[model samples]
Target chain A: MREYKLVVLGSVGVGKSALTVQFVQGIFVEKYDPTIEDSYRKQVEVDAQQCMLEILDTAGTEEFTAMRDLYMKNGQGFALVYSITAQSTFNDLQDLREQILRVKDTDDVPMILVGNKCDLEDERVVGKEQGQNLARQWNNCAFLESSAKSKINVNEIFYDLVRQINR
Target chain B: ASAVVVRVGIPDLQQTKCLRLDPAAPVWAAKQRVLCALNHSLQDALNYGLFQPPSRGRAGKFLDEERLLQEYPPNLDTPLPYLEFRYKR
Candidate 1:
């Protein structure tokens, strides 16, 4: 089967693993540790084409900076995830994008911008249009908001990216 | 408006990681992006810390990187403190 490496990037507590779980296993974990590290590989057929989707759920905290090189090296496509709750994490995207570019050595890479935890809108600080604007600024990457807890658009995000890959 | 849930401690699992989001997102598009970000950041953090060992033997104890990504908790009601924090009026 063809392999597709997709990296999930974001800040410390942005529900990265929860999103992965909901998408890959169709489940959600309530207690999450920002320090725990994990990755999963699954084969899904998108538009009749069988593609291997390797997902890496990484920590968003700054302490994990040293390992950025390892994750970026293997990914063909990048999914930049940021929480709408934290503006600082959103701001960090530029640096993360630059690092990905430096490691991947390409600006044309297909990137999907994801906003997580739509279930908690009261605590939301970042605006949807703000994120869309960011995506537009960066090659018009696709944008979507999802709730891993509620399974809201969780699968669609991955499928959409896969569709974009097919396109 | 979607329901908001909050999780406290990280659960004990073989190859799973837990994350928390404060002031969760309001829109569907933004939430997906946030999920992606959290997954990436947490994995990278663990890879640099727990996954990396000085010797090969120690590395054996390290959880499978790929499997870790796929691990998910069974339910959303266990330790996560769920609250419906909808958008401002």
Candidate 2:
């Protein structure tokens, strides 16, 4: 079994923690501090392959520069999450992209773009096409809209990461 | 949050265990207390976790290792929640 060390990032209250927890245990959880660094381990099936996943929930550390640099160097894959309800949250992804790419000193890292809180259709200000267009420019990386509250495409987020890194 | 200290009692230890944590420190700083109390590496922090127990009329939460104790500051009228040291094993 191979181990995949994953890092999750996003703006404040963008569901990075929510997305990670959703992928791990199937959430009954809601309403908690969004800026807390959490860790999780899971065994999953990826392409009929046995996998051990070490998840570093960095949603809490976007403001903690020293901490970000420490773990950014060790991450194998990344999940860039954002809230569709807020366009400012959507706009924050580019800096995050540069952060990991430059920190790792490589541009070919395994990563995915997640438009979280998609269940809030009326609340969405960032269009679906907007997400797709960014993904297209970022080397056509996998992009998907998800809602941790509704459990939409939660598994796909990590599945794509594992697939990309495994290949 | 002026110099607030969080104290805890370890289950099964007959000493009525107590600890003092600065509310300004991050949750991992508190986890170090657990590691040292239980005889583990002080910096080998990721192996263990601290929990916000569910007794305050709301569900408990797993305090992130990166977050500061200041976020969960001391209360005046009611006692602050006992941050439980959880075994992720």
Candidate 3:
């Protein structure tokens, strides 16, 4: 068995907490409360290999901006989350990605571009193609669109990233 | 749209309520209804969990906070057995 520490990042209300909780607890949250940070542990089997995952769900507030580098340093894998309904959150990831590379000092870091809230089709501003294009631009990082509320693609994002980190 | 009937349980208080909610409604909506049915304020209801009964050595599952009732469909015979609600201190 192996162990991995993963960090989730993005602007506020990108469904980071819901995504993390959904993957860990198989539930979704509709309320948005500013998170300070939360840690969760789960035993999962990825690619037929049992692994322990330590997930850090971090705050998206600007007040916590100073702590991101620290979080990035402690993480082995990253989930860059953004709401498809909020284009600003998607735009915010570029700076976050750059910061991660700067902190890690590597372009080959294991990470994924997550487009969340796909269930809100009527409110969607960022298209799936745009998310894919951004992922491709970011060194072809893995990309996924998930809905924590709808429970769509929630597990795959975490499992796939863990697999990426293991490799 | 059809209504989905589900049960909400407060383990600590030993209380339970059956609600008829829109299948497509958000979890928060169900939370609101649970609060009304239980006569509790939103501030009093701090957390909620959807319970998964023990099966095959899994030791039961407690799915906590933030989800729609529709996400966990109840069997025809089960009536969505339990939703655990936690209160603030």
Candidate 4:
């Protein structure tokens, strides 16, 4: 069985766990709150490929400056998540990408820029074109807008990244 | 001259029993009352906004609230009628 360590990084309440839960479990919880400060793991299958994906849903902490380094040292791929409802979270992606380069020791990794919380369309602060433009700037990164609550493109993000990894 | 008809769609009110399993208080009694608090807030908003108390005509025969608000209804038997709006010049 192949092991893939995927790290999902974002600010607090950006729906990291919700996306992971929707992808792996396919059940949406209306009242989910993040309790732990570090890792959550789940196994999933992609195209009859039995694989174990160790999911790291990290908490947004200003104190944990080296959190990205620790995650990249162990992670095979990364999904940088940002809430479309929050503009500052989207701005944090630049620092996140820089950290991935330093720790992963490679500019070319299966990476995705996810603009989460598409369900809150009326409250959206970050536009889709901004995220797409940012992702285009990176070598192999792609951007996707998703809603964990509405279960929109939650699984596509995983499948696309997995296909990229296989290729 | 033309006029616009603004037909309001409201979900049907149902009486579902909420059970409490406590031995002392057999009826479901909320301790923290989080749901209660949220309900009050929503109720306040509705009252302040365009909320009207349901009339006591028919109980179960009331319009299905969910069906009316839904973008697409599941059943095709009694499809929801469309509301037509017109402008006046």
Candidate 5:
């Protein structure tokens, strides 16, 4: 078994925490501090290997500056989101994603660029092609759009990234 | 939307540590964060509860551990009050 620390990052998009809570809530347990308690946790299997996946939800914690800086340093995989209907969210990812690479000082960082809020398909200001192109720009990284309300590809997103990191 | 950071006091400790909690966060959850940071064991958490110091028009009482922080009692500090981790007596 291996411990994988995954951090969720975004421009204050609302769905981030919901994504974190779903997989863990079914089997979540509280035996430690609130930081550990607050962070989502689960045990999952991929490629016949056991994984202890822990998620740090940026939406639930108020300490932004230090929190992101500190966790991104330790994070093995990051799931970054932008609201599909909000261009401000879409544009905001560039600088933050750039900073992740800078702070990690590595190109091999495992990441998935996500356009969340796909349930709000009626109000998409940011197109699916744009999200795919952005991922393509970043060396053709893995990409997906998810809807926590609709439960679209939520687990697959993380499990794919888990595979991304373990490789 | 998310939790606001609040300061919590320990009796022998003068410097209060910051606790980040959603108002929906129950009292026990806050205690878990605050005491656990101090490296206190889980029993340390159970033995103490958040107490609002008596002030203004309200007489202070220990917070209900199971209750949510949004329902926090009227406190001396405007808008928000810093709670103390007090001994159960």
Candidate 6:
């Protein structure tokens, strides 16, 4: 069995906690206070490969910006999430991506672009193709649309990164 | 007269219990039921949040401590999902 540290990043209220909680416990929490930084450990089977995953669910507050560099330094992979309904959140990912690259000092780090809250289809402002195109522009990062409430592609996002880091 | 029953799952304790509640009952009543079933005091119950399963574009909705359960009715056939008591120190 292998071990990996994965960091979850996004703007506030993008369901970062919900996504992580759903993946770790198979339950969706209704209300979560903005996290400072919470760590969770789970043993999961991805692609039939056994591994222990340490997940860092970080706070999205600007107050935590000073601490993000340190978080990035410790993570082996990342999930950059944004809510589909919030276009500004999607736009914020570019700055986050740059910071991760700077902290890791590499362009080849494993990462994924996640568009969350897909269950709110009526409120959606970002299209699926938009996410795909952005991921392509990011160069080599994977992209997925997921819903923490609906349990859609939640596992796939984590498993994909674990697979990428494992290789 | 048939009574309405809702199954509540406590994920931390790995326990599930069916409780008979009037759909019009307040949401806190279900929390009370769980406390009595577990032999816990009201103070201990304050740490838990009663949640409904995800439906209609909303993820699990937290039962307002003071609102009616009828405000967020159960699906009649499935268990309601609630997280185990979160430690609040």
**Best by TM-score, which number?**
2
Q: Which of the two, 3 or 4, has more DockQ?
A: 3
Candidate 3 DockQ vs. native: 0.03
* Residue A109 of model 1, lDDT score: 74
Pairs clashing within candidate 4: B11-B65, B12-B65, B20-B28
Please identify model 2 stretches exceeding 4 Å from their true place: A60-62, B1-89
lDDT of 1 at B3: 34
Task: Please give the RMSD of candidate 1 to the true structure.
Answer: 15.0
lDDT of 4: 0.59
Better model by DockQ: candidate 2 vs candidate 3: 2
Q: Is the docking of candidate 2 incorrect, acceptable, medium or high quality?
A: incorrect
Q: Which docking class does model 5 fall in?
A: incorrect
Return model 5's CA RMSD, one decimal: 10.7
TM-score of each: 0.64, 0.68, 0.65, 0.61, 0.64, 0.66
* Candidate 1 lDDT for residue A79: 74
lDDT score, residue A76, model 3? 89
What CAPRI grade goes to candidate 6?
Answer: incorrect
- For residues B58-81, what per-residue lDDT tens digits would candidate 6 score against the true structure? 676566868876677555442332
In model 4, what lDDT does residue B38 have? Answer: 26
Q: What is the C-alpha local distance difference test score of each model?
A: 0.63, 0.74, 0.76, 0.59, 0.72, 0.77
Find the number of clashing residue pairs for candidate 2: 0
lDDT of 4 by residue, A1-167 (tens): 77677778877778887787677657775665542332434557888988766666666666445544566787777788999999999998898788778876678788899999998989999998989888888864788999999999898887777777887
Better of 2 and 4 by DockQ: 2
Residue A75, model 4: Cα distance from true site in angstroms: 0.5
Give DockQ for candidates 1 onward, in order. 0.18, 0.05, 0.03, 0.01, 0.05, 0.03
Error of 4 at A32 (Å): 5.2
For candidate 1, give the lDDT of residue B13: 22
Tell me the lDDT of candidate 2.
0.74
lDDT of 2 by residue, B1-89 (tens): 44443434333221112345667888788777666644331234455477766653566677787998778643233343355564564
* lDDT, candidate 3, A1-167, per-residue tens: 78888899998889988898788777666777556555667888888889988888888887645456577998889999999998899999999899888988898798999999999999989999999999999989999999999999999888888888877
- The whole-model C-alpha lDDT of candidate 1 against the native structure comes to 0.63
Candidate 5, residue B6: the lDDT equals: 68
Candidate 1 chain A worst ten-residue window by lDDT: A32-41
